Symmetry: D2
Subunit: 106 residues, 4 copies
């Protein structure tokens, strides 16, 4: 999609997890978010349309995305091991990368 | 997806990346493999239908999707950093994980 | 340290962790847990002294060592933000990875 | 310990990883760089002695060791499967997270 769209894609599935009924709901959000990640991972955001894509600062906006996905599929290692409340909670305790990025980069 | 088509996409991108020129195809191909081995996460294997789905075998079967998916995203990290070939590199070392499964759960 | 030793260390620091009181008292045994898991990662127990170091069945064994200290730090990663009972919770899913391996190769 | 000397632990061990020819040298070096990361993780650098441990400057700063030990361990993977060319070829690559959190927070 586009950097801004992707970001609402993840605003969606992150409350649909918090809402999560079952273990497929979670499983499906987490999918459509690492899906939704990668797409962001390759964008240049507003601010840093001045830093090279080689810049230390782009590595890191790009590494914010790294981190995120690791946090996601580690939520998926808890959705697929039968326990959703702990997966749900990895998905809340996830906003720490979210705000991390924004503050640096939005 | 069904397992063996997930596995086919997996294999097919493992060839793309192997035969890739630049940052995109690697990124695009590893982005595909992601969703792919994401999906197989839950998909169930024949040889483990006679183990509970909340068993240490089934845990340790899904756990190999955890991994896999990460070497993929770690490679994506170098793909998404311009380090084209060494994403191709990372692509090949992946294959410890893929195998390690096959020799346990195929 | 050889095998059994890295283990009980990993298995003592677990108890230390469950009961402990502060994020810095649960830190240092999640670091202990790790450091030992690093030294366990070179190991080759009896059930796999059987097979080769290039064996995939060797590679899968030294992969729960990858997983584990992966999630050890996902657990270390919560202590550091004042999240104690969450990172003591991570300490408890994290043993489905002690699980995985024992059910295969001990 | 205080973070200061942690950040010269890490550096030299890079000196001592690209000053290897074989496993343990590249396999142990990386070992203690993980301890190196582990303790630093908790410390408040000079430049955030004004912000709260709940703050997204800190969340992010100490997320940067999260990564690191991933990139380290991940290069210890290949160190343990025997792959020195591939774990050294990969330790110097971690580079772009050394110099990523420097430029931001150092
Ligand atoms: C590295 C990313 C991988 C590649 C390349 C392939 N796989 Fe797998 N895989 C696994 C099992 C138990 C099967 C059996 C299929 C079934 O029973 O229906 C498969 C299947 C395949 C196939 C072909 C299957 C066919 O009949 O056509 C290919 C070509 C293939 N896989 C390639 C196990 C696993 C697994 C468990 C965690 C890992 C991660 C991978 N395989 C990874 C790869
Ligand atoms: C937390 C993640 C873990 C705990 C807690 C324990 N293990 Fe391990 N383990 C593994 C093997 C292959 C052995 C063989 C023992 C031998 O060498 O004879 C063990 C052993 C233990 C022991 C008993 C030690 C003794 O004989 O005196 C305990 C209490 C124990 N383990 C607890 C394999 C693995 C492994 C593979 C990657 C995982 C990650 C762990 N074990 C993890 C834990
Ligand atoms: C690794 C970096 C990264 C993290 C992670 C990230 N964002 Fe963003 N986010 C950005 C950037 C850059 C912008 C501003 C992009 C722009 O203005 O074009 C942004 C902006 C947004 C926007 C503005 C949308 C718009 O269309 O104007 C929303 C909504 C948002 N983030 C939600 C989220 C949520 C929810 C999460 C976690 C589920 C998240 N973001 C995680 C980098 C990130
Ligand atoms: C998570 C953030 C982060 C990581 C990752 C990081 N640094 Fe540091 N670095 C810092 C901070 C903060 C300081 C300031 C040290 C102080 O005086 O407390 C620093 C300082 C240093 C120094 C100067 C030591 C001094 O006494 O001033 C060196 C050398 C250094 N880092 C090397 C490295 C290397 C090599 C790596 C990667 C293996 C690395 N750093 C990774 C944050 C980081
Ligand atoms: Cu965090
Ligand atoms: Cu990087």
């Amino acid at each position: 999609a586009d950097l801004e769209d992707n970001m609402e894609t993840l605003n969606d599935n992150l409350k649909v997890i918090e809402k999560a009924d079952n273990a497929a709901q979670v499983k499906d959000a987490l999918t459509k978010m690492a899906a939704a990640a990668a797409d962001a991972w390759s964008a240049t955001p507003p601010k840093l349309e001045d830093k090279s894509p080689d810049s230390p600062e782009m590595h890191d906006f790009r590494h914010g995305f790294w981190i995120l996905i690791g946090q996601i599929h580690a939520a998926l290692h808890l959705a697929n091991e039968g326990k959703v409340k702990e997966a749900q909670a990895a998905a809340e305790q996830l906003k720490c990368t979210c705000n991390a990025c924004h503050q640096k980069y939005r």
